[PDB]
Design a protein around this ligand. Sequence first.
Ligand code: HEM
Ligand code: NBE
Length: 153
Amino acid sequence: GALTESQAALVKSSWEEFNANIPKHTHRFFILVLEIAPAAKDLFSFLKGTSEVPQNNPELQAHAGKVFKLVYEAAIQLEVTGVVVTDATLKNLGSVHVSKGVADAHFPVVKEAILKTIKEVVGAKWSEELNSAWTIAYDELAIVIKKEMDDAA
Ligand code: HEM
Ligand SMILES: O=Nc1ccccc1
C-alpha cells in the first residue's frame, strides 16, 4: 500500500473519529486488552487492588488516549515523508515500560486491541484499503517503541 494520499486521508479521518470519544474508546480498549490477556491487569497501578476496569479513572483515560494519538501521527508522517521519526518522548516511553514490567509479546495484544477498536470506531466505511493503512501505521510505530525499551532495559 505504502501510504498513498488516499490511504492517509483514510487514517486521519478514522482518528478523528476515535478522539471524538476518549472515556469510551479508552475503557473499550482496556477491556479488549484484558480479553486478549487477563494477567495484564497486575501491571496497571490503577487496575491493581481493583476487580473491574475503572471507567472514570483519570489516570486510565489520559494514558490510553495518548496511545492512539501517537499511531495516527505516525501514519501522516509516513505519507508525507515516507517514514516514522523517533523523538525524546518515544525514548521516555520506552523507560517507563520497562519499570512497569512490560515485554514485546505484549505488542500484538495492544495491536489487535487497537485494529479491533478502529474497526469498531469506523464501522461501514471500513475497507481493506483502511485496515491496511492502520496496520501499516501501528506496525511502523511499535517498531520504534520496542526499539526504545530494549534500549532502557
Ligand atoms: C505503539 C504502541 C504503544 C504506545 C504508543 C504506548 C504508549 C504509552 C504511554 C504514552 C504511556 C505513559 C502515559 C503517562 O505517563 O502519561 C504508557 C504507560 C504504560 N504502558 Fe504503554 N504504549 C504502547 C504499548 C504498550 C504495551 C504493548 C503494554 C503492555 C501491556 C503497555 C503497558 C503500559 C503500562 C503498565 C504503563 C504504566 C501505567 C501506570 O502504572 O500508571 N503499553 N504507554
Ligand atoms: O499501552 N500502553 C498504555 C499506556 C497508558 C496506559 C495504559 C496502556
